[PDB]
């Protein structure tokens, strides 16, 4: 029993974290095989970050300008190239701790674990979701740029995020491992604002199934709804539309608990129009939207890595 | 900026997780140097779960009765001893991934990361607090016994918990790494109930200071209170008494935010009386009590 946020074990990723220093800027890099990946803004100064020409700044750099440190060992950079907003530093040594890995771009609503680092040293691990507005509600201080988000699939690490910046509202923005930003963001000091966020509906439904599996049933009701009537209500409360794919994905949880997806939707609809009435679900007074249907199944069944 | 419930990186602990099998029971063990630690109830049969005599069951066991598996490699048990509720299996190979470590017993209110394992394989990492009633609100299934709780404060792993059992209310009970249970619990299937839980007051105050550091000030008020008047109110809401030690511990946060501890205590009294009124603090509609003052300073 019990339901907790829970991140993937971070060991496979910790063996990849290195410190990347260029001039006065020090941030984190991901060392996989003979390449170190990090945000390209490491090559920037204060004048540069206002309006940067990364191709021009990078062409003026030499390999010895990048100081890469793996533990107490300095790696030597033998090449440098840029792919979108990520900088690739070729090193002479392949990381002996390189796990089986893949670079994957995730969709809003999908979850991943963040290994927060400072000076190439992992300090914490937390689970979060790619918000529908493409920000993440992370926890990051200065020097955490280059910290990565990942998932584990069997013995394979899927790297899906690298931290680049913090928006004025305290939310975070970053890229996949190919340097492509999640969201309408750019890697420079300029006026940027995250769009109005929405609730990840399929994730709330998955978390309601997790609550039923844990014995919390007070919110269940006799009612069912059409997908169209539910979505008309969902749109109204700033909730993401629920697609037929989401309904299909909730299938195993629906089969396990005996509560059809549209029946759980009718519980969610009443919960939105009426509230919790001083009650809690899994110790929470708010509907949790950072557990996907796969996360709920994995945790309420014990899949290991 | 931002505030998250955050576990320590689990890598140093993952390299220590092994599978321990005795008869039909299979659970997790912690392999440090040439010793594998695990709950002593791994030696228990169906007949010996209500009133097991562990000294008697252990004396009937031999080293070849314990099957230890580290990855796909079977370790050879060359000795067995019991320390309180923990079983120590001496092995013929020292763990090459053994980190710098210590065994520490924690106090209620203290937080730690849990590496949940099944069959010696880590499946997830999460954050816990030792509840005032000495239980933990974990997320554990059958097979998770021997999963450990730890803190990694600079380089060294402090092992503070080993999972042993689930109580009828879905909460969890376990021991430190010397086999001493946290709480009035025994490793028997006898009728056991956790005491009524209470909110860890000092941790709620630390989390209110974290919210002020992050710019959330709506709950602040112009009131202060005496420690005694605060404790009289807080206890009516099943909150733990706040001692002078707790007030002293909140000192750096008080100095950083400019809000005296007794002033923040008055904001806490107001919150308990009014509720949140549809507002949230750090994205939460409830008062969070699983961030200690040390956690808040570290994360901020
Ligand atoms: C009654 N019983 C069963 C096996 C084991 C037990 O509770 N272990 C389990 C661990 N973590 C979550 C669980 C979730 C569902 C079931 C078991 C769980 C145990 C251990 C002791 Cl020391 C005494 C009794 C006892
Ligand atoms: Cl949690």
Swiss-Prot record, chain A:
It catalyses: TSAVLQ-|-SGFRK-NH2 and SGVTFQ-|-GKFKK the two peptides corresponding to the two self-cleavage sites of the SARS 3C-like proteinase are the two most reactive peptide substrates. The enzyme exhibits a strong preference for substrates containing Gln at P1 position and Leu at P2 position. It comes from the Viruses. It comes from Severe acute respiratory syndrome coronavirus 2 (2019-nCoV). The active site is at residues 41, 145. Changing residue 142 to A: Does not affect ability to cleave and inactivate human TRMT1. Inhibited by pyridone-containing alpha-ketoamides compounds 13a and 13b. In turn, alpha-ketoamide 13b (tert-butyl (1-((S)-1-(((S)-4-(benzylamino)-3,4-dioxo-1-((S)-2-oxopyrrolidin-3-yl)butan-2-yl)amino)-3-cyclopropyl-1-oxopropan-2-yl)-2-oxo-1,2-dihydropyridin-3-yl)carbamate) inhibits SARS-CoV-2 replication in human lung cells. Inhibited ex vivo by michael acceptor inhibitor N3. Inhibited ex vivo by compound 11a and 11b. Residues 1-305 are cytoplasmic. It is found in: Host cytoplasm; Host Golgi apparatus; Host nucleus. Residues 1-305 form the Peptidase C30 domain. There is a cross-link at residues 5, 90 (Glycyl lysine isopeptide (Lys-Gly) (interchain with G-Cter in ubiquitin)). Cleaves the C-terminus of replicase polyprotein at 11 sites. Recognizes substrates containing the core sequence [ILMVF]-Q-|-[SGACN]. Cleaves and inactivates human TRMT1, preventing tRNA guanine(26)-dimethylation of tRNAs. May cleave human NLRP1 in lung epithelial cells, thereby activating the NLRP1 inflammasome pathway. May cleave human GSDMD, triggering alternative GSDME-mediated epithelial cell death upon activation of the NLRP1 inflammasome, which may enhance the release interleukins 1B, 6, 16 and 18. Also able to bind an ADP-ribose-1''-phosphate (ADRP). This is 3C-like proteinase nsp5. Changing residue 132 to H: In strain: Omicron/BA.1, Omicron/BA.2, Omicron/BA.2.12.1, Omicron/BA.2.75, Omicron/BA.4, Omicron/BA.5, Omicron/BQ.1.1, Omicron/XBB.1.5, Omicron/EG.5.1. 3CL-PRO exists as monomer and homodimer. Only the homodimer shows catalytic activity. Interacts with host FBXO22; this interaction promotes the proteasomal degradation of nsp5.
């Amino acid at each position: 029993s019990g339901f907790r946020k829970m991140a993937f074990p971070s060991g496979k990723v910790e063996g990849c974290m290195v410190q990347v220093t260029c001039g006065t800027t020090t941030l984190n890099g991901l060392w996989l095989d003979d390449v170190v990946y990090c945000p390209r803004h490491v090559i920037c100064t204060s004048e540069d970050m206002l309006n940067p020409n990364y191709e021009d700044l990078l062409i003026r750099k030499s390999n010895h300008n990048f100081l890469v440190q793996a533990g107490n060992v300095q790696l030597r950079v033998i090449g440098h190239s840029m792919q979108n907003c990520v900088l690739k530093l070729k090193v002479d040594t392949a990381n002996p701790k390189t796990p089986k890995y893949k670079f994957v771009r995730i969709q809003p609503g999908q979850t991943f674990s963040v290994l927060a680092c400072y000076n190439g040293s992992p300090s914490g691990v937390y689970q979060c979701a790619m918000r529908p507005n493409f920000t993440i509600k992370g926890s990051f201080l200065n020097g955490s740029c280059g910290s990565v988000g990942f998932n584990i699939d069997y013995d394979c690490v899927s790297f899906c995020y690298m931290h680049h910046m913090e928006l004025p509202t305290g939310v975070h923005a970053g890229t996949d491992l190919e340097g492509n930003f999640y969201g309408p963001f750019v890697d420079r000091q300029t006026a940027q604002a995250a769009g109005t966020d929405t609730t990840i509906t399929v994730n709330v439904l998955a978390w309601l199934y997790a609550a039923v599996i844990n014995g919390d049933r007070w919110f269940l009701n006799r009612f069912t709804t059409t997908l169209n009537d539910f979505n008309l209500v969902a749109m109204k409360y700033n909730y993401e539309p629920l697609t037929q794919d989401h309904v299909d994905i909730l299938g195993p949880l629906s089969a396990q608990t005996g509560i059809a997806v549209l029946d759980m939707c009718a519980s969610l609809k009443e919960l939105l129009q009426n509230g919790m009435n001083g009650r809690t679900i899994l110790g929470s007074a708010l509907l949790e939207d950072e557990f996907t249907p796969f996360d709920v199944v994995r945790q309420c069944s014990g899949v290991t890595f």
